[PDB]
């Protein structure tokens, strides 16, 4: 038990990176989050750090030299000279070239790796990097609005001092890049809950369980549209409890993508902020070194609410439902409250479906040593 020491990573410049006209990914949401939680007074209870800019050396602990050289070189003014490389590395459409792209990667990654170092040094219990969580980036390829996989880099940092690391992903999308990086090792178990079926990235079937020494160390919980707080709560705690019991990790990384909330512009789930944050509460109870990361999230008022509340949860600090005045106060109308209501959308995940998938995953977890 007990309240935990929390270190939080933020760079004020993050909100100025712009993916381009009409692109749904808005780094500004991280600044909105920051401003809201400062206005609730949460800075009084945690240490706030500005991350360093991760170097090419740091990024090539996972990514290829050629891919990182390309990301460090490509700019809107020289794009026409790089048309071949852009296609090779899947940059230029979903993952656009924007001003300051590499610096955005460096700040996103720096927070996650800095948090992992702090955890390794036993100087904090929890580290938070809401600018992180870019779970789709691959060794030599951008994907899913992600360029550099800060998560994989942070886990590699943790593996210097931790024999077994658990990765949990509650973003609505499958954490495919993290899963791929660790698919053939038992030193990282990856557990993703996600919408599955005619949905990005197309991976994360129940039957994808890892390979080689990593067989049984990837866990995928495929879901349908409309999952609600009750349905999610009923499987998350039992799955994570069984994973904790069987895998016995010494550190945890939790990707908290807010695109699994009700009303998300790109998502199709029906979780409230309380339902999402219940996941952070469950993981926190195991009293392991914990790195909490961001992720997707497209209805930006709800992203700010979600990550503010989850910061409060990390701190065991009760905050009022009445939102404090802040620099983005108009974004939180018409109610100006912290918590959200679910919609009346149909939950396609029947209780029987949820129990059945849970039972199939428990069968796989029985195969751990």
Does 173 bind ligand KJF (CB under 6 A)? Our answer is yes
Which entry of Na ion, Zn ion, Ca ion, none binds 296, CB below 5 to 8 A by partner kind?
Answer: Zn ion
Which entry of Ca ion, ligand KJF, Zn ion, none binds 169, CB below 5 to 8 A by partner kind?
Answer: Ca ion
3-state secondary structure 279-300: HHHHHHCCCCCEEEECCCCCCH
Cα–Cα distance between 139 and 147 in angstroms, integer? Answer: 10
Residue (of 17, 40, 43) closest to 28 by Cα position: 17
Tokens (6 digits) for 339: 């918590």
Please give the sequence-ordered ranges of beta strands (E in DSSP) within 10-125, or none if there are none.
Answer: 47-49
Catalytic residue chosen out of the listed positions 34, 63, 135, 136: 136
- The order of strands in the sheet holding 290-293 is 47-49, 6-9, 126-129, 290-293, 251-255, 165-169, 188-195, 218-223
Residues 118-147 that bind ligand KJF (CB under 6 A): 133-134, 136, 144-146
Residues 197-216 that bind ligand KJF (CB under 6 A): 200
Could you give phi then psi for residue 182, rounded to 5 degrees?
Answer: -110, 15
Residue (of 184, 220, 27, 204) closest to 108 by Cα position: 27
Would the annotation count 188 as a binding residue? yes
Q: Which residues, in sequence order, are CB contacts of 332 under 8 Å at separation 6+?
A: 301, 304, 305, 323
Does the active-site annotation cover 135? no
**Shortest Å, Cβ 20 to Zn ion:** 19
Question: Which of 25, 113, 181, 319 is in the footprint of ligand KJF by CB under 6 A?
Answer: 25
Residues 248-267 that bind ligand KJF (CB under 6 A): 257, 259, 266
Does 295 bind ligand KJF (CB under 6 A)? Our answer is yes
Stretch that binds Ca ion, among 11-19, 69-77, 162-170, 299-307 (CB under 5 A): 162-170
Q: Kindly state the DSSP code that residue 226 receives in the 8-state scheme.
A: T
**Shortest Å, Cβ 7 to ligand KJF:** 20
User: What are the binding residues?
Assistant: 22, 26, 169, 171, 173, 182, 185, 188, 192-193, 217, 259, 265
Residues making up the annotated binding site for Zn(2+) are 171, 173, 259
* Residues engaged in binding ligand KJF (CB under 6 A): 25, 133-134, 136, 144-146, 171, 173, 200, 257, 259, 266, 295-296
């Amino acid at each position: 038990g007990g309240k935990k020491k929390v270190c939080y990573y933020y760079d004020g410049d993050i909100g100025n990176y712009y993916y381009g006209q009409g692109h749904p990914m808005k780094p500004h949401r991280i600044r909105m989050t920051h401003n809201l939680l400062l206005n609730y007074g949460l800075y009084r209870k945690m240490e706030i750090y500005r991350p360093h800019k991760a170097t090419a050396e740091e990024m090539t602990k996972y990514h290829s030299d050629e891919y990182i050289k390309f990301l460090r070189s490509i700019r809107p003014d020289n794009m026409s000279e790089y048309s071949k490389q852009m296609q090779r590395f899947n940059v230029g459409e979903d993952c656009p070239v924007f001003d300051g792209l590499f610096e955005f990667c460096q700040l996103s990654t720096g927070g996650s790796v800095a948090g992992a170092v702090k955890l390794n040094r036993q100087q904090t219990d929890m580290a938070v990097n809401w600018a992180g969580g870019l779970h789709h980036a691959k060794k030599s390829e951008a994907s899913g609005f992600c360029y550099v996989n800060d998560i994989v880099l942070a886990i590699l940092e943790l593996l210097k001092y931790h024999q077994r690391v658990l990765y949990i992903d509650i973003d609505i999308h499958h954490g495919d890049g993290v899963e791929e990086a660790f698919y053939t090792t038992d030193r990282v178990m990856t557990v993703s809950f996600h919408k599955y079926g005619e949905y990005f990235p197309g991976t994360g079937d129940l039957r994808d369980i890892g390979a080689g020494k990593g067989k049984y160390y990837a866990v995928n919980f495929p879901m349908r549209d409309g999952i609600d707080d009750e349905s999610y709560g009923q499987i998350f705690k039992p799955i994570i409890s069984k994973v904790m019991e069987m895998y016995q990790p010494s550190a945890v990384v939790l990707q908290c993508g807010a695109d699994s909330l009700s009303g998300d512009r790109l998502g199709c789930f029906n979780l409230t902020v309380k339902g999402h944050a219940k996941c952070v509460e469950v993981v926190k109870t195991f009293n392991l070194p914990l790195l909490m990361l961001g992720g997707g999230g497209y209805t930006i008022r709800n992203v700010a609410r979600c990550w503010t509340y989850e910061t409060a949860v990390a701190l065991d600090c009760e905050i009022p439902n009445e939102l404090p005045y802040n620099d983005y106060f108009e974004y939180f109308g018409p109610d100006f409250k912290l918590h959200i209501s679910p919609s009346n959308m149909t939950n396609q995940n029947t209780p029987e479906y949820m129990e059945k998938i849970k039972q199939r995953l428990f069968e796989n977890l029985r195969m751990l040593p």
